[PDB]
């Protein structure tokens, strides 16, 4: 089913519960950066992204990773040769659930003149990739950009068992839209 969870949600709302819920059904939580801490403190066991994509991470808070044949795993069809291939490789994981929202962009005019520098240097680059990747998976992998629908997902999983096409679809569409 859905047994891995890469949740690097910029906005740290709902992740607490979501993560517990997951941990309960199983679903190894492979988050990093902010999320990691918050969860490994609330109690939810979380594994750091470090041991998945070949090389670790950097400047937590936005950057993190950006690995080709790891985003290509989740991407689309994690069970169809060519595509799936990028979710296995060398310890490379076949993560099936992703939720990474993007803190909205802002300019925040500083008292001493517009903080253009910082502004530009806080445009999430990592996020949009992971997101659009997972999103791409109208099939297999499920992406949940929006934080305000953790319920629906959890609900379905808990009850039904596996996620539903209908849902996967909406989720993806929404995620792409969000990156837009």
């Amino acid at each position: 089913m859905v047994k891995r969870a890469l949740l690097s949600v910029s906005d740290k709302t709902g992740i607490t519960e979501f993560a517990r819920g997951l941990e309960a059904l199983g679903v190894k939580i492979i988050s990093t950066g902010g999320t990691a801490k918050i969860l490994r403190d609330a109690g939810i066991e979380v594994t750091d992204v470090s041991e998945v994509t070949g090389y670790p991470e950097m400047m937590g808070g936005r950057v993190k990773t950006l690995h080709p044949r790891i985003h290509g795993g989740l991407l689309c069809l994690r069970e169809s040769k060519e595509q799936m291939e990028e979710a296995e490789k060398e310890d490379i994981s076949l993560i099936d659930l992703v939720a990474v929202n993007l803190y909205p962009f802002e300019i925040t005019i500083s008292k001493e003149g517009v903080e253009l520098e910082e502004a530009i240097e806080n445009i999430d680059i990592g996020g949009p990739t992971l997101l659009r990747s997972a999103a791409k998976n109208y099939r297999s992998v499920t992406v949940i950009s929006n934080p305000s629908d953790y319920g629906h997902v959890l609900k379905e999983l808990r009850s039904s068992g596996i996620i539903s096409d209908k849902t996967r679809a909406n989720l993806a569409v929404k995620a792409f839209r969000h990156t837009a």
């Binding site: 906005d11 740290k12 709302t13 992740i15 607490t16 902010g34 801490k37 918050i38 808070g61 803190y103 909205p104 962009f105 802002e106 300019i107 925040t108 005019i109 500083s110 008292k111 903080e115 910082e118 502004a119 806080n122």
Partner: protein
């Protein structure tokens, strides 16, 4: 049953044979013949198939000493000499006593039973010699005298036999006269040497010949006969008749102590923990069954077998496998392979009991200053620590424009070359701000550059790296986000020095179980509430979230701690890293959604607030000090002491050991400039000085504004004091 294999078994027998061990060493002045003696000793007793050594400098098992002709640092080898029909394991402590060494000297000396003072037959007792001898003796390491290079006198300077022994006598004299001024109590316990007592040999390492009063008689070979062979090209005969290893190993065993005995007085002098304690009695009177004592003194990182830490098995049998600890860094690592040292290589053996330097792999808690133990919180021979960071930086430039590339790579290597600096390798200006640990260290490295690589470059005025510090407890300052939808009422106050120290110690971490960390802090001083409400530690700064029941703060956290770390990296005043600063968050008005809580809004507010607070709490600077140790003559103390006093020399000890006024003080790093020169200049060239990071200290308020202004200028800042007023804007 190869000769080597039979020796190997012998090796093991001797290992579990502490009474038949001799952990000896070699102590001498530069270019006296250390490496020479060493390697030719190895080959002298033929422990290995001769050829093996020589060409591949064995004793020099590392890579630096391997091109010198005189020993430089530590490691060890082994000899097994047959004396009156009896073999004895002779560990050969490599000597890290070259003047270019401080703590290392001590470290090895605290693993050397005794040594061999090697005095050039011509140049005689030398400054270096004096230093090493006195040191070693201080740490209770009985030596013997092997006047090497007699060959020179005999031939080169065509001296006659009678004169030969007149000169050597005068040396013997000098030797003891010093020993006397070093420790009269030990000179009363008869450690002093004399060739008639077999504790002094005579020979030439480079020619492998060597004699000594006893052997002399035994064989019939007299000083005059020696002179005859030397003058008549019979040094080959000499060598054969009276081997070098022969005489040396005789001194090394017949008059030099074994683990057991050595350990006794050694523990009594060096160690300070109550000898009634088990560990104590264990390592005093030969016992390896007790608490593990394995002070790693070397890390032979075998490229094809991992980190192989080499320490003397003062206590602690080495049965295959053992989860243990260490001194200071007493964490929870194990102990896998424990090879002993045969020849210069690592012969893998099982259980090693007492006085037998062993190399252990799979040891995370194992470096210099760490005495690997199986009894947590092990008492200290000589207190040690582990922290050391760049405090004195210089702006290495490249005058010669046709050198930049070379420079770039040379300092790109300098990193591991000497892991004590942190060059800010840049392209914007080309000025590589090399951050060293000490003005002298800097000077040394810089010199090494245009010497071993020879880049036609220099270095500009060294500058001290300060820390920014607050003075009092502040009043809640509101940090407002641009959009005003977030307000962060926060205050700060000085960080408790105790907590400071322990955080720099590393034990207190943010990766620590609540209970664990909390407790430590709680007793250290941190009021329970705060200890329970901490959420981050940066160098010597903490952000104690002391608020309760604030919606969305749980998540929010990150952005605020970001601002926190930013401001802490460069304080609002002197733009220096903050240190000894603890913040307490008191209120967190937040907007409901995250739209109006995006990092671009949070980060500013926090930053703004913290900075404003710091400035309102009389921001000062911390100046590092640098514990001085001046190994100088007794007599010499007038100008010396007055000098340090004029340089704020807090004397913490003066050790006026007989004819030596070894003053131990503490002087501010910034004021250490020039001291190098003046000390010796005034003391007629008689001042072996050495220093070490004396800890940051609240800069004397005296001329704080002055120091501040200087920094401001140098780092090109504004002349209006960065008034908190503005930071805490509308």
């Amino acid at each position: 049953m190869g000769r080597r294999k039979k020796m190997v078994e012998r090796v093991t027998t001797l290992m579990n044979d502490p009474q038949r061990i001799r952990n000896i060493g070699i102590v001498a002045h530069i270019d006296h013949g250390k490496t020479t003696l060493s390697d030719n000793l190895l080959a002298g007793a033929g422990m290995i198939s001769k050829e093996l050594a020589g060409k591949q400098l064995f004793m020099d098992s590392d890579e630096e000493e391997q091109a010198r002709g005189i020993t430089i640092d530590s490691s060890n080898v082994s000899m097994v000499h047959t004396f009156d029909n009896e073999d004895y394991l002779i560990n050969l402590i490599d000597t890290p006593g070259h003047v270019d060494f401080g703590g290392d000297v001590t470290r090895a000396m605290r693993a050397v039973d005794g040594a061999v003072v090697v005095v050039d037959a011509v140049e005689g007792t030398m400054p270096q010699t004096e230093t090493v001898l006195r040191q070693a003796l201080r740490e209770h390491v009985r030596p013997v005298l092997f006047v090497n290079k007699v060959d020179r006198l005999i031939n080169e300077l065509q001296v006659d036999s009678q004169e030969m022994q007149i000169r050597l006598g005068k040396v013997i004299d000098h030797v003891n006269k010093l020993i006397k001024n070093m420790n009269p109590e030990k000179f009363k316990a008869g450690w002093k040497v004399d060739a008639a007592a077999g504790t002094v040999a005579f020979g030439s390492a480079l020619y492998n010949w060597a004699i000594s009063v006893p052997m002399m008689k035994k064989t019939g070979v007299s000083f005059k006969d020696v002179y005859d062979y030397c003058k008549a090209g019979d040094m080959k005969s000499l060598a054969e008749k009276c081997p070098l290893h022969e005489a040396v190993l005789d001194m090394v065993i017949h008059f030099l102590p074994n683990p057991i005995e050595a350990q006794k007085g050694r523990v009594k002098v060096i160690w300070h923990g109550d000898e009634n304690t088990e560990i104590g009695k264990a390592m005093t009177h030969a016992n390896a069954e007790g608490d593990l004592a394995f002070m790693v003194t070397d890390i032979s990182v075998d490229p094809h077998a991992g980190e192989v830490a080499t320490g003397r098995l003062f206590s602690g049998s080495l049965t295959r496998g053992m989860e243990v600890f260490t001194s200071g860094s007493a964490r929870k690592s194990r102990v896998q392979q424990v090879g002993i040292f045969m020849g210069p290589e690592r012969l893998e053996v099982d259980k090693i009991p007492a006085g037998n330097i062993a190399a252990v792999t799979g040891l995370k808690e194992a470096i210099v200053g760490s005495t690997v133990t199986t009894l947590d919180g092990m008492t200290p021979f000589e207190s040690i620590r582990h922290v050391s960071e760049p405090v004195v930086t210089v702006a290495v430039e490249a005058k010669h424009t046709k050198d930049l590339p070379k420079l770039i790579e040379v300092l790109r290597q300098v990193a591991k070359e000497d892991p004590t600096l942190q060059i800010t390798l840049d392209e914007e200006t080309g000025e590589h701000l090399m951050a060293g640990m000490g003005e002298l260290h800097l000077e040394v490295i810089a010199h090494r550059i245009e010497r071993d690589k020879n880049v036609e470059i220099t270095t500009s005025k060294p500058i001290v790296v300060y820390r920014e510090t607050i003075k009092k407890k502040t009043e809640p300052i509101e940090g407002k986000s641009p959009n005003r939808h977030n307000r962060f009422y926060i205050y700060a106050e000085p960080l408790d020095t105790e907590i400071v120290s322990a955080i720099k110690e590393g034990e207190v971490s943010m990766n620590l179980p609540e209970l664990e960390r909390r407790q430590k802090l709680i007793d250290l001083g941190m009021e329970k509430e705060e200890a329970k409400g901490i959420v981050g530690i940066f160098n010597s700064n903490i952000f104690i979230d002391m608020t309760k029941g604030i919606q969305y703060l749980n998540e929010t956290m990150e952005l605020v701690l970001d601002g926190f770390e930013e401001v802490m990296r460069a304080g609002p005043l002197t733009r220096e890293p903050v240190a000894n600063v603890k913040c307490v968050l008191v209120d967190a008005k937040l907007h409901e959604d995250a739209i109006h809580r995006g990092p671009a809004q949070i980060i500013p507010a926090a930053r703004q607030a913290i900075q404003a607070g710091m400035l309102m709490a009389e921001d000062s600077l911390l100046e590092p000090y640098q514990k001085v140790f001046v190994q100088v003559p007794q007599l010499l103390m007038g100008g010396a002491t007055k000098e340090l006093q004029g340089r704020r020399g807090i004397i913490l000890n003066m050790t006026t050991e007989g004819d030596l006024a070894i003053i131990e003080a503490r002087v501010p790093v910034a004021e250490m400039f020039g001291f190098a020169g003046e000390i010796r200049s005034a003391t007629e060239g008689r001042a072996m000085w050495s220093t070490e990071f004396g800890g940051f200290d609240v800069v004397p308020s005296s001329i704080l504004n002055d120091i501040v202004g200087q920094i401001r200028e140098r780092k090109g800042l504004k002349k209006e004091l960065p008034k908190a007023s503005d930071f805490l804007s509308m």
